Each structure stands twice: as C-alpha cells, then as structure tokens.
Amino acid sequence: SGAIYVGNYRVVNRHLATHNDWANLVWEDSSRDLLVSSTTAQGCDTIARCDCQTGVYYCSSRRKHYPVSFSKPSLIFVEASEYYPARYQSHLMLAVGHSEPGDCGGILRCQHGVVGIVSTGGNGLVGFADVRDLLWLDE
Ligand SMILES: NC(=O)[C@H]1CCCN(C(=O)Cc2cc3c(cc2Br)OCO3)C1
Ligand SMILES: [Zn+2]
C-alpha cells in the first residue's frame, strides 16, 4: 500500500484505489496502473521533473529503503494477475530489487523529488509506475 499526496491530489495504484478515490476521481489509466483523486487537505510531497535513473525506494515487505538503478519509462509486458489481464503496461521502469505482493504503493525518490510508486515485481525485480510526466499534479 501507499500514496503520493501533492497539492490537492492523491496518487495511488489504480488496482488499490478505494471507493472514496473513485468517488473523487480526477484521472485514471489502466495501462499505467495509476489513479489520481482529489483531496481537501494540502499534500506533503513534491514531484521530480528530471531524467534520473537512480534513486531510493521504500520496500514495505522489508520495512526498509533500498537504492536502485532503473530503466527509463517504457512499455513492458506484465503477466495476468487477479487485477488485470496479461497486457503491456506503459510508463513502467524496471530495476533489480526486492518486491513482493503488498509492496505496491512504495515511493521511489531521487534528489529532485518523487519519481513514482512500486507497481510490479518479479524474481529479483521491482517495477515502478512513473509520475514525472504528469505536469498538472503541480498546478
Ligand atoms: N501493475 C500490475 O499489473 C500489478 C497488479 C498487482 C499484481 N502485480 C504484481 O506484480 C504483484 C507482484 C508479484 C511478484 C512480486 C511482487 C509483486 Br508487486 O515479486 C514476486 O512476484 C502486477
Ligand atoms: Zn531526479
């Protein structure tokens, strides 16, 4: 679990969005596993606007942060799960690192701010949904 709170927006994994997220929907994209909903309180986070490929993410299954080198946002095949059919997920960045079910929502940050959130995982792999292109989160 986990969310980014920026301005009057909350960014979550689309597959973990609550009834309240859908009732306050701003934007969602099943191909990116992202959903953004509106909030009344002002957020705590700031978003990176950069091309970093290294950073640090939070891994809830280890209660720890780990450094990572990750690929640029791209279209990557993701196997079927209870949440989605087998499909290509866009704007996904892969890295070598620990991940297990329950780790989605963990934040990836670089020196400039929040880069994205954990969205997928494999055997020694972790995938992050990028949010750096969503320029409207800031205004
Ligand atoms: N973005 C999606 O399509 C995700 C929907 C929820 C399911 N999903 C995953 O990847 C789950 C997952 C599977 C794992 C793992 C870590 C994670 Br996270 O390590 C070993 O096998 C895919
Ligand atoms: Zn950066």
How would you explain this protein's 3D organization?
This protein has one helix spanning 19-23; strands at residues 4-6, 9-13, 25-29, 34-38, 54-59, 64-69, 74-78, 87-96, 107-110, 113-122, 125-130. It is mainly beta and 139 residues long. Strand 10 and strand 11 (125-130) form a beta hairpin. The longest helix is centred in the first third of the chain and has 5 residues, at 19-23. It binds ligand A1B2L and zinc ion. The site of zinc ion has 6 residues, from loops. It is classed as viral protein. Keywords: Diamond Light Source, asap, A71 2A, crystallographic fragment screening, PanDDA, PanDDa2. It forms a monomeric assembly. The entry is titled "Group deposition of Coxsackievirus A16 (G-10) 2A protease in complex with inhibitors from the ASAP AViDD centre -- Crystal structure of Coxsackievirus A16 (G-10) 2A protease in complex with ASAP-0036562-001 (A71EV2A-x4673)".
Summarize the structure.
With 139 residues, this protein is mainly beta. It has one helix spanning 19-23; strands at 4-6, 9-13, 25-29, 34-38, 54-59, 64-69, 74-78, 87-96, 107-110, 113-122, 125-130. Strands 6-5-9-10-11-8-7 form a seven-stranded antiparallel β-sheet, with no helix packed on it. A four-stranded antiparallel β-sheet has the order 1-2-4-3.
